[PDB]
Amino acid sequence: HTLPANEFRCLTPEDAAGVFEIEREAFISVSGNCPLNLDEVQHFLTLCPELSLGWFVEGRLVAFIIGSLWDEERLTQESLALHRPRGHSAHLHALAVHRSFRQQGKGSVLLWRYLHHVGAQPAVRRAVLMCEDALVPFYQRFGFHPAGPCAIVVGSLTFTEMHCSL
Numbered sequence: 001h002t003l004p005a006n007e008f009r010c011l012t013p014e015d016a017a018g019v020f021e022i023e024r025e026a027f028i029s030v031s032g033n034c035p036l037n038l039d040e041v042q043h044f045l046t047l048c049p050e051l052s053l054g055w056f057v058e059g060r061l062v063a064f065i066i067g068s069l070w071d072e073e074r075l076t077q078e079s080l081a082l083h084r085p086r087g088h089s090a091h092l093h094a095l096a097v098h099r100s101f102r103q104q105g106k107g108s109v110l111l112w113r114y115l116h117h118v119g120a121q122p123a124v125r126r127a128v129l130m131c132e133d134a135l136v137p138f139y140q141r142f143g144f145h146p147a148g149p150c151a152i153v154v155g156s157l158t159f160t161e162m163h164c165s166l
């Protein structure tokens, strides 16, 4: 009968649309590329929805995490579009908060619930993601440790890989 003022839930391919939209502003408007395009978004939301998480305010996605499982110590170019069911690592492909909802602890909040959410799964024993050097201290507040230069290349952009024991 109404729109919950706040709701945290796993995503479904129905939210792919909304995810890309925030990606356009969050990444493309900046570097010219984005972590996941609509097909990639629907791909992981189809194969491993339980690895995603969204914050809906008044029926609108304001934050999201799109995961997938990895089975190697470090991230590679191929892992970018892969989901290793047999893996034990939660690979955070993308994390973003809406342009209008930033700097209000939402990213931090979503990130913590996410770590707790996937660490609840029997397989997931570690979390991994890549980020620009500017965000390394940010992810460290969550237990992530810088694991050196990430091998994944994206345009002219480089990233520092980070791992979090779960």
Ligand SMILES: CC(C)(COP(=O)(O)OP(=O)(O)OC[C@H]1O[C@@H](n2cnc3c(N)ncnc32)[C@H](O)[C@@H]1OP(=O)(O)O)[C@@H](O)C(=O)NCCC(=O)NCCSCC(=O)NCCc1c[nH]c2ccccc12
Binding pocket: 026, 027, 031, 033, 034, 035, 092, 093, 094, 095, 096, 097, 098, 101, 102, 103, 104, 105, 106, 107, 108, 109, 129, 130, 131, 132, 134, 135, 137, 138, 154, 157, 159
């Ligand atoms: C970061 C996040 C989710 C936090 O939310 P929030 O705004 O609500 O933040 P909080 O309120 O919870 O707390 C704020 C903290 O967030 C950190 N922070 C925020 N903006 C920062 C900045 N410009 N530089 C350094 N630290 C910053 C600070 O440390 C800051 O501390 P302070 O309270 O002391 O100020 C939110 O700001 C957001 O959605 N940003 C846009 C997308 C993005 O970059 N996603 C992450 C890429 S990392 C993960 C990822 O998706 N990788 C894919 C890698 C990738 C593939 N293709 C790309 C193309 C381009 C770029 C990257 C990629």
